[PDB]
Nucleic acid binder design. Sequence first.
RNA 1: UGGAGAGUUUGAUCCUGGCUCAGGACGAACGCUGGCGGCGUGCUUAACACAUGCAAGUCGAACGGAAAGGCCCUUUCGGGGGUACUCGAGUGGCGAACGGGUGAGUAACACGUGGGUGAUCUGCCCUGCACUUUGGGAUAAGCCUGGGAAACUGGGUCUAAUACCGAAUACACCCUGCUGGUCGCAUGGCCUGGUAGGGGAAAGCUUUUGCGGUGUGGGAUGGGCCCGCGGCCUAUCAGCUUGUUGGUGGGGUGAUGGCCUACCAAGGCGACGACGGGUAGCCGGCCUGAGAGGGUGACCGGCCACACUGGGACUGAGAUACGGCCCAGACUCCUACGGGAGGCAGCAGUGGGGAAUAUUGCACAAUGGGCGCAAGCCUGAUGCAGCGACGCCGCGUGAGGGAUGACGGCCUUCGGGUUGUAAACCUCUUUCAGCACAGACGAAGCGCAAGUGACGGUAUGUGCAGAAGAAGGACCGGCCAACUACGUGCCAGCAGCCGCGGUAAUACGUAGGGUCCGAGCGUUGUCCGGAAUUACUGGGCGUAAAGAGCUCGUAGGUGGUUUGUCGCGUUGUUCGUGAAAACUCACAGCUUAACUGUGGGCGUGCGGGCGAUACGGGCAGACUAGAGUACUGCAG
Lengths: 200, 113
Amino acid sequence: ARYTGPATRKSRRLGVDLVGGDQSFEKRPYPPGQHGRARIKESEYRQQLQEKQKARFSYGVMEKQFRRYYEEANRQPGKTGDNLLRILESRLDNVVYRAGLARTRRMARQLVSHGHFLVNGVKVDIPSYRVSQYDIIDVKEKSLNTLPFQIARETAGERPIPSWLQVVGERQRILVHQLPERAQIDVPLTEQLIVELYSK
Amino acid sequence: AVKIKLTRLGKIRNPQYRIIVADARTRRDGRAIEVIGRYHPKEEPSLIQIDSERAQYWLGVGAQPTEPVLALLKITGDWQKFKGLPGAEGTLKVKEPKPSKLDLFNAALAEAE
RNA sequence: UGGAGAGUUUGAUCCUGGCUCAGGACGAACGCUGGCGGCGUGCUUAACACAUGCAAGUCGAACGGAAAGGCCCUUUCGGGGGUACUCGAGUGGCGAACGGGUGAGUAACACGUGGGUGAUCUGCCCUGCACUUUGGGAUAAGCCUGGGAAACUGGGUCUAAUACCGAAUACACCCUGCUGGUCGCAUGGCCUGGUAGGGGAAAGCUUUUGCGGUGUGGGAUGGGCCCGCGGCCUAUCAGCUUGUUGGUGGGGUGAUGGCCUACCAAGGCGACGACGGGUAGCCGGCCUGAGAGGGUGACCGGCCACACUGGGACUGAGAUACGGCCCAGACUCCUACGGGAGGCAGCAGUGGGGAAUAUUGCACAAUGGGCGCAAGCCUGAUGCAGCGACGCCGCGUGAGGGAUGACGGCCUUCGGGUUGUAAACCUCUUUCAGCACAGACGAAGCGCAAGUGACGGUAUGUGCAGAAGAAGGACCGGCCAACUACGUGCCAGCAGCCGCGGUAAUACGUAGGGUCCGAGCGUUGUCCGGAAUUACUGGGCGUAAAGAGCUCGUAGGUGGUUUGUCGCGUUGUUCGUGAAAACUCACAGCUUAACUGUGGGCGUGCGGGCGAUACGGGCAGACUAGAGUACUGCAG
């Protein structure tokens, strides 16, 4: 499935802004509901859980998929935290968002799911698609003139494109040199808390 | 009679076969004396690998190929080598390799500039 | 690569110790809810009883034939003859022992692993060598006729063969006697050793890519038999055994062997648990775990056992002979009462049992199998489809903008706050569904015919329209994310534990709000973890549970200093094996994933050779510090 409810709720509950530039979170940075002002009891479990919720509500990944990702990242011979972060970053919708072609991760996911993109010459419509080295992500010719891609291709002054990505074509081609490392990820939260939570 | 059969593998839609040497009385997916190649008909050129020396040995002791295996043995030339009629000519149409991802990557980068 | 804790005994504390909880899994079931797809999976209970339809045939190039199509002669349209293209029934060959099902029995050489067979068989297949001579008697079918209700069956006549039978040849083979050499691991084996005697077979068909028969040498495959080791619970089961333990001569078998038998001897097994009782198919694997270990044997794969119950053989290269035979029994059916028929633990299906498990579907297109020279025929094996959120995986139910933040709800300190960027509105996009068009791969296949895909007009691709057709469940006192109001009052109820209900409950019921998950969410059942709570890793015994009342001593366990030797343990290396699948690493292919393939690792072990000798052990010694004796005193 997918989460379709209000986005500001999660930002307010988690105490950080996940969309990035939302005014409602700044207007009220406290949890929602009647009792959004009550002091909370401090518990390591609560902090670890909130870190995991931050991670999986920033990228829009449900719990089962997140658990699969954590198992995959732990199995790998790196270290668990950055492995998980790089697996999350390698998603196609996240790549589209960080490529400056989508204002928000939700619209990047919507564009990918509608098959507006095309990876390595073959149409791909899977937001969970993972992107490998030397991947060429292209917009199909029919939808190049649509307003979303229009306003994406004339506002290329927003959030900087990370190093591991590079837009090279005036038609907004995307090239992937290598999977991102922990230094270049530039994500909120703490991976160690998630690793601790999933070892409980 | 020991025979050179094709056992089935793969999932439901895509049958991928192994060229096995087995007794005629065993089931299709039973124990195999030897595995001497594989055959994937789902590909456009339908990849075929046959280990030539083992095939020669098993034909020499008198194994009987089935009809698909006989066709494959003719294609790879093992059957003709075993008999000797036209020679041992490789008619195998190998799959055409795909260019490397790095080649396409640098091609796109150069096309940008 | 890798171990997380919390609550509960007290007025309070520390410890010991049990109970409970947070995790994972499932062939699941139940409750509420429910859109789609991919890939899997589905009687765990009654090895209960089964309606119905299919699940093993094939060959006319073995044979006599001519019932049905074809063709040709003939006609009164009743038909009649020939043909052999062809083919019912029949003789004959091969197959039917495979494949498919089930887990009742079995605690056993059944299984796993490693050996042995100088103690053995092997149809079809491959490949050497030698042959394929000669004669005869029948009979099925057909025709005539009899009995019986039926099942079925008797007689007469007649006919063929690659059916059956006699003989010759074989001297490669089998048996016997003598005899040579050689290798051993003892019986023995080998040199197709030599030599004398006796003996053992065959089948033809077909003109077309032609198929066949017999003996014998060697391969290949498939077995049989024997053995080491390994994996349950029970002395509130201590004796068990008389073909039972061994020998000899016979018999029997493919083969060794009390396998059988006559005689002879009196052995054989057992606390290292015989003999009984209970339970159970075994394994690769699966789940859990940090690991060791624990639980398990669903799918898939191998072996075993069985086919209504219990015995028995026959045919055959091969028989637990599922869809063979004989007998006995129970049950069901037919009967003219004389007698007959049947076996779903094959595929669907029915009834019953149960908490619970599916269609009386399509196709031989692909793979495997049987017969055939072949075309071809058969194949409920198999490939697919149908049904079930049963499981895993993936996707959608919209995206951007949108405020001193509308209405309503709820709370209120009456100020306002929250639902809430949520909504309303303005744009955008259409994934998946819906409609239209086109439309596969799977088939370097099969076929000497012109064609051939069950799935399927599916997947898929391109257009069309519109946010349009698409969210629920549990929980919120602490463990353990998430609190207020009203209703009720020791009631009604909740509860995994602690414990909550006594008119102002964050614990009941309902509403707002919230949190966790999400086509699912919870409950129950079961196994592992947490549990170091059976403690090998990794616990203990003064007072918490736990030192026998104390000795002697049997089996067993364990053992001072030192020399030489063995290489049993130990250790190094190498060879064989440890099926595949599974697991892990890497790569590849499905739009990704699940899934699938490829190549390594793993397969922790066992068998053979070779190396080492510190330690343990054995063997052969030596020493006196342990142990014991002697002598002189001593206390009780």
